[PDB]
Design a protein around this ligand. Sequence first.
Ligand SMILES: Nc1ncnc2c1ncn2[C@@H]1O[C@H](COP(=O)(O)OP(=O)(O)CP(=O)(O)O)[C@@H](O)[C@H]1O
Ligand SMILES: Nc1ncnc2c1ncn2[C@@H]1O[C@H](COP(=O)(O)OP(=O)(O)O)[C@@H](O)[C@H]1O
Ligand code: ICS
Ligand code: CLF
Ligand code: SF4
Ligand SMILES: [Fe+3]
Ligand SMILES: [Mg+2]
Ligand SMILES: [Mg+2]
Lengths: 522, 477, 276, 271
Amino acid sequence: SQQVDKIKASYPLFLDQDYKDMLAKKRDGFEEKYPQDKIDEVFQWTTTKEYQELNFQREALTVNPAKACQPLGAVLCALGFEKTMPYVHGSQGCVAYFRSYFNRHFREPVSCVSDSMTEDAAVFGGQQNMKDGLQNCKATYKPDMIAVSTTCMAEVIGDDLNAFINNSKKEGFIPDEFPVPFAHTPSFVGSHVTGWDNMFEGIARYFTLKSMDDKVVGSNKKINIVPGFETYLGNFRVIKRMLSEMGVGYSLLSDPEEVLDTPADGQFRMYAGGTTQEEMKDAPNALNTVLLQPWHLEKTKKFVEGTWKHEVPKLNIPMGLDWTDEFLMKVSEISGQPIPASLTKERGRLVDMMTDSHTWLHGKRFALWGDPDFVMGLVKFLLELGCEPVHILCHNGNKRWKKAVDAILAASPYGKNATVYIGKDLWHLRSLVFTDKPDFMIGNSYGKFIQRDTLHKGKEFEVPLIRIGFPIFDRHHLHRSTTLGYEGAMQILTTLVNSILERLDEETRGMQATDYNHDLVR
Amino acid sequence: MSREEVESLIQEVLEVYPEKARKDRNKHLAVNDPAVTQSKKCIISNKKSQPGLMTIRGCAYAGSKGVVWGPIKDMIHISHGPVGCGQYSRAGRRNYYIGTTGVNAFVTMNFTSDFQEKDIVFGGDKKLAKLIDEVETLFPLNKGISVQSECPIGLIGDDIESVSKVKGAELSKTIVPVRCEGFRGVSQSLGHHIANDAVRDWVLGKRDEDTTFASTPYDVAIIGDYNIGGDAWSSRILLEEMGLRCVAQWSGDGSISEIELTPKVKLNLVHCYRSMNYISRHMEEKYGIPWMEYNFFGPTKTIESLRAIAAKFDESIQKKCEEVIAKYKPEWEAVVAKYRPRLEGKRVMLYIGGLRPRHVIGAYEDLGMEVVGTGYEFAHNDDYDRTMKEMGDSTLLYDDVTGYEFEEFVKRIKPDLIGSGIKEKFIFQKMGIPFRQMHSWDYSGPYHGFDGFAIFARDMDMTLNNPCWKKLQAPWE
Amino acid sequence: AMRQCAIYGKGGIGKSTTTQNLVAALAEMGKKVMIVGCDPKADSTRLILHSKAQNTIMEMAAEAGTVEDLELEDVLKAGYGGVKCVESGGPEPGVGCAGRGVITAINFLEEEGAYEDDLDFVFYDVLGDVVCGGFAMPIRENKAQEIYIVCSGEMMAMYAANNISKGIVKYANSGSVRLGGLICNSRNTDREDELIIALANKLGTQMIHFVPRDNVVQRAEIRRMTVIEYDPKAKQADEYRALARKVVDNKLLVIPNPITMDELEELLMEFGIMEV
Amino acid sequence: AMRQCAIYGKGGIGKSTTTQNLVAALAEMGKKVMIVGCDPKADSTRLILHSKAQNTIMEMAAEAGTVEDLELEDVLKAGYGGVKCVESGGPEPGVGCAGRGVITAINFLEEEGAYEDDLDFVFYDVLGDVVCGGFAMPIRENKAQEIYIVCSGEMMAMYAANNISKGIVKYANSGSVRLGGLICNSRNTDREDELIIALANKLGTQMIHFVPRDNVVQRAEIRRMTVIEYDPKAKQADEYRALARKVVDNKLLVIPNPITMDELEELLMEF
Ligand SMILES: Nc1ncnc2c1ncn2[C@@H]1O[C@H](COP(=O)(O)OP(=O)(O)CP(=O)(O)O)[C@@H](O)[C@H]1O
Ligand SMILES: Nc1ncnc2c1ncn2[C@@H]1O[C@H](COP(=O)(O)OP(=O)(O)O)[C@@H](O)[C@H]1O
Ligand code: ICS
Ligand code: CLF
Ligand code: SF4
Ligand SMILES: [Fe+3]
Ligand SMILES: [Mg+2]
Ligand SMILES: [Mg+2]
C-alpha cells in the first residue's frame, strides 16, 4: 500500500510488514535456501586467513576485476579530437556498453558508432561493414574525422583495418583525403589504458609519419602534452591552467574536456572543442613532448622518440607535492619560462594545508586500487602526508611497474607495511581488508560492496570507501574534480582528512557513551 | 499529427542517408493505423542494423547474461571470454534480489575467465575447467553455474558443453553452457531465445520424475519479470492477495529451485512476451501448462489483468480478485486525483526494448497523457502486432531507430516527455526536454502494480514539472 | 544405426575424391548417405551433384540475412544415388574465419534436424590443417564416431596423419570418437603399402585399404563425376567398392598413439628413403 | 632496402622446403636473411637450424603468461649461414586459434624491432590452408611486399594459385604487396614448364624458376638439412642457387588477374 502524500519507493516500501511476510513465504516455500546459520558460518569463513590463502591460489577464475578492455580507452582517446567520431569495427554490443559505461560516469552523451558485424561478417570478414559503415557514419553524423578501433571478434579473425579502410576509399565510399586513423585494440591484451595508448599512437602516426621531412624540433616553440586515459575533467583543466599561468605555449593532444561537459542550453552538441587536425600535424615541431601517464603510454613514447625525435622527459605523473614540483621544473627547463610567483604561492598553500592536517593523517592505513599511474601517484602523495599505504592493488599493472612502486615505498618509513599486488582483483582485495584491516579504502564505486561486506562482520570491522578513481557511478559530479597538480593534491588531502573526521564523528556520536570525544573543534 | 505530415517528416529525415541505408530504414518507420492487424504490412523489424548509424541495440550476450540468466540469484554466472563484457554489465541492471551476496547469492558480482592472448590462441577449455574448480572452492553454497559465452568463445570453437558435462558430473553440480556469443543474431533478442533454450535443455527437466512437491490448483508462475527496482515483488503481492500461490518468478529474485519447480504450476503468467514466450510455449507443449500475457502497468491494465487471471480459476479466486480491486481503489484514485491534473494533455515519446514500448501506454493514459511516438530496439512483428492497436491513429512508430532519426523526430514532434535509455537521456535533457529512464526507472520504482503506479506518477510529475526546465535559456539571450 | 565418419588428412592428399567415390559406392550398394563439406574451398560435394557449385550454408545465410532466416531445403541437395549434400561455405583465402563457418553450419544442420535417421552414413570432409576448434566440430560428442585418415607413403602425408592423431586424442578421451584406420591414397612410392601398414601399427590402428593412383580419377573429375558413376566397371571403381565394404564391416576403432618425429624419420629410413 | 617476401601455395606443394633451400642459397651468397614461420606446426626453419631445440613465440608466451614478458633473443635463433629463424607456433590441431597466433607473433616481431638490424631479406613461410585473416598477416602493409606462389602442373595446384591470387587482390589494391612470380615445384607432368608459363601470363606474372623433382630434397630433409648444406655440389643445389639469383635480381611485381575456373579448365585441356 501507499499513502499518496508520502509515497515509498523500493526502499523503504519493501520493509512493510506485508511485503516482508510475502518475501519470507517466497524464500521458505520455493527457494530451498541454505539455513541462516550455514550462511553465517560460510560468511565468517570468507573473512579468514584460511580463505585468503585459497583465494590467492586462484589461477583461472577472476572475480570483480578492476579493469576494462582496450576499446573503451580507444573511444575515450578518439573523443578528444575535434569533430571526431569514435568508430569501433566489430560487434555492436560492445559499443552499447562503452557508451553506457561512460554515460554513467560523466552523466553526458557519449557518441560512438559500430559497423555491426554479425555472424556472417565473422565468417566472411567485415570489409563490407567498414565500407557501408564509413559512408553511413560520414553522411549521417558529419564528423571531420573517424577514428577506428576494434572489438575482440574482429581481432580474432584478423580483419585488416588498414586494407579495409583503404579499399573503402579506393572504391569511393568515403573521400580519399578524409582522415580515418586506426588502431588494433584487442580486448584480450592489456586493458582499457592499453587501448588509449594504441589509439593515440595510431592517430599520431596517421598525421605525421609521411611528412617528417620538413619537421624541425622546437620550431613552433610549444610543448606537447599527452594526458593518457583521464576521467576527471579537472585534470585536463589544471594542466592547461598551470601552463598558461607560466606563459608556456602548449598543445594538449587528445582533449575531451569540452565534449564531456557541454552546456544544457537547448541544443545537443554532438561534438565540442578537442585537439585539431592541424595541432596533430604540427606536433613534431614542438620543443618536446610530455607524457602525463607514462606507465600506459609506452607505444606512444616509442613513436614520439623514434619518429618525432623528441627527448621525452622521464617524469612521473604530476600528483602530490614532489612530482608536481618536478613536472613544473622540467616544463620550465624545456620552455625557458620561470615558474611564476602565483604557482610558487599555490605550492606553499598546499604545504600549509599539509602542516594543518598532518596530525589527523599521521599513520592512517589505506587500501587502494586503480590504474597504474593513478595508483602510484596516490601512493606517493599518501607517503608525503605521513599515511601508510597497506594494500596497493593494480589489476592491470605489470612487473616493472610493481618494482617501481616497491622502490617508492622503500624510500619512506611510511611504506614499511605496504604490499603491491598486480593481476589481483577486488575479491582478493576483499580478503586483505578483512585479514589485515586498514582504516579506509580509496577506490572506485565497486568498492561499495566491500564496505558492505565488512560492515556485516561488524561495525568495528567496517572499512569506509573513499571514492577516487574510475568509474564513479553512485555519486554525482565527482568527475569534475582534480587529482593532478597542487590543486588536485589539495582536493585529495581535503577528501582524506575529512573522511577521517567524518568517521571519527560517527564513532563518537553515541550519547553518554562515546560522545565525550565528540569535539566541536578538530 | 496528420498522416500526410508524419509521412512527410519520415521522408525528410531519410534524405541524409546513402541509398542502401535509405532504402532499408524506410521499412522500419511507420505511421500507425490501429485498424491494421498485420504489422508486416506496415513495418519491418528484427533485421540487422545498418553499419555506422549509431543503433541503440546491444548483443546476444546482453540478452542472455544481462537479461535472463544474470538475475538468477543462487547461481554463479561466468562471463567467459575477455574482461570487457562482464565489467560493463556488472550491476548495471536493477534486477532486485534478497540474499547474502558472495555467500549464497551472487547477482552483483562479476565472475569472468578474463581471457588473455594465450587463451585465444591455445583455447580456453582447460582454463574453464580450472575456473570451475576454483568457483566450487571459494563459493561452496552456489547452487549451480552458468557459462555465458562472449564473442571469442564462439569463434575459436571451445567445447564448453563437454566441459559443463564433465565437471557437472565430477562435482554433482548443474553447469549450464550458453552459446550467447555477441555476434549471433542482430540484437539482445536472440540472446533471450538462446538463454530460454539453455534453461530448457539443462535445468527445467531436473524434477520431471520427482513427485515430492505438493502442488495446489492455485499454483502459478510469473514468467518474464526481472524485478527492476522490485517490480515483481509488487506484482507477486497482488497475485497472492488474490489467493494464488506464486511458485516461481522468472528470473527477477529468481532461484534455480523455483525454475525447477515451475513445471508443477497450473498456469504461466507471462509479463515479458518477447524474452520468455519461448520457454512458455515449451512448457505448454511438454507439460500441458497454459500461459497468458498480462500487464501490470497502471490501474486500468492491472485491474483488467487481475480479472482475466482470476477468471481462469474458480469463484473463490474471482471473489478475492474483486476484494483486492476494492482495497486498492481509493489508493490509485488518490494518485490520479493528485497527479493527473499536473500531467493531463502532456505528450510522450518512448523508445525501449521489446515490451515496455507498448506495455506502459495504459499507465500514461491513466494520467491523461498521450503517447505520440513509440518504438523498440529489438521487437519482432508479433510485438508490433500488439502495439498498433494500443497506439493512436497517425502516431509515429520506429524500429531500431538511429541516434540521428530519434533526435530529428523529437525536434519536429516536440514531446513534453521522453522515456528511453541511458544512452538517450543526456542528449534530450540538453535540448530541454524532460526525460525519464524507462529501463532503470531512473533508480526509482517499482512501477508494476498498484504500489508501483503511485511511484510512476510521482516520478513523471517530478520530472515533467521540475523547475530546472524553465532555466535553460540565459536571460540575456 | 546411423554411423558418422569424419575424413581427415593432408590437403591435396585426396580426401574429397576418396570420400565422394567411397560414398557413391556406398549409395550404389543401397546405403543412405549424407556428405557434410567442412572445407571452405567447398568442393566436397561437386562430384556427387554433377555441377561444380552447390550453394553453401554460409553464403545462403548471407543472402537471406542471418542464419536464422535459412531453410534446410535451400542448402541440402541430393546428387548421385540420392546422396544428400551440403557445404558449410566460408571466406576466400586470407579474410574472415572459416572455422566459425563450420561451427555455424554444423549447429544449423543439427538444429534443423538434418540428421533424420533415414541415413545409414554421414561423412564429414574436413580441412587438412585443422587449425582451430571449429574444424574439430565434426568429432565432438554426438557427431562423428569414426575417423579415417587419408595419407600416402610420402613423409609429409605421414607426419600430417600423426599430427592429426595428436589432436584426436583430446576428443577421443572427452567423448566416444575413435580412429577406424588409415586409407592409403597411392603416390606410387617404393614399398608404399608396407610403409603405411607399419605406420598404422605404430599408431595402433590399421591400413584399411590401399587405393591405386589411376588417371581414370582425373578423367571422371574433369567430367565432374565420381569414378563409380563415370565408369562402373573400371578397376578403380572396384577399388572404391572394396574400400566401401571394408568401412561398412570395420570393427577396429582405437585411440591413436602418436609417434615422435624421430620415430617417423627412422621408419622412412627403414624403408629405403636414403637409398639413391 | 630490406626486401620482405611471403611464400604461399597449395597445401603440400613444397613451400617450406623451397623457402629454406632458397634462403640457404641467399646466405651462401652473403645475404643476411630472416625466416618467419607462420604455421602452427612450426616446421619452417627445421632445415636451417636442425641443431638444438627451437622454441616458438606462442609457446614461450604461454610459459611467460603474456607476449609483453617475452624477449626477442629467446625465440630468434641463427642457423646455417647465419640465417635467423623464428616460429610463430600455435596450438596442436583441433583447439585454439592458430590464425591469432600468427597475428600475435608478427606484432611481437614488429614491436621488438626484429626488422631493425640490417637484413637484406625476410621470408614468411605460411601454411597452405589460408582460412582466415590471421594467415594473411604476412601481406599487410609494412610486411611482405613480394609474394611468390609455389605451384605445379597439377590441377589442384593451379586452382590454388588462382584462388590465392584472388585473396591477394584486396591487399594489393589497398597497399604495396605484389605478386613476384610463380615457382614451379615440378611433379614431372607432361610439358609442365610451358603450362606454368601459360598460367603466369593469364595472371599477369612470370614463372621465375622451374624447380625439378629430385629426391635428394627429401634425403636432405630426413637429415634436417637444405640441399645447399647437405650436398653443395648436387644438381638440385645448383637449381636453388639459380632460383636465389633470380629472386635477388627480380623487379617484376604485379597485381594478379585471377581467371575463372572455366579458363583454368580451358588451359588444362589445351595442353
Ligand atoms: N623439388 C622437390 N623434389 C622432391 N621432393 C620435394 C621437392 N620439394 C619438396 N619436396 C618434398 O615435398 C614434401 C612437402 O614439402 P613442404 O613441407 O616444403 O611442403 P609445404 O610446405 O607446401 C606443406 P604445408 O602446406 O602443410 O605448409 C617434403 O617431403 C619435401 O621434401
Ligand atoms: N586415386 C587417385 N588417383 C589419381 N588421382 C587422384 C586420386 N585421388 C585423388 N586424386 C587427385 O588428387 C587431387 C587432390 O584430391 P582432393 O580429393 O581434392 O584432395 P584433398 O581433398 O585432400 O584436398 C585431385 O585432383 C584428385 O583428382
Ligand atoms: S526482458 Fe527485455 S531493453 Fe522484456 S531485453 Fe531489456 S527488464 Fe527493456 S523493454 Mo532494458 S524486452 Fe525487460 C527489457 Fe523489456 S533489459 Fe529490460 S528495460 S521487459
Ligand atoms: S558483442 Fe566484450 S566489450 Fe566487446 S571488445 Fe570483447 S571484451 Fe570488450 Fe557482446 S559478447 Fe561482449 S559485449 Fe561485445 S565483446 Fe561480444
Ligand atoms: S584459426 Fe580458426 S578460429 Fe582462428 S580465425 Fe582462423 S579460422 Fe577463425
Ligand atoms: Fe550532464
Ligand atoms: Mg577436399
Ligand atoms: Mg609448410
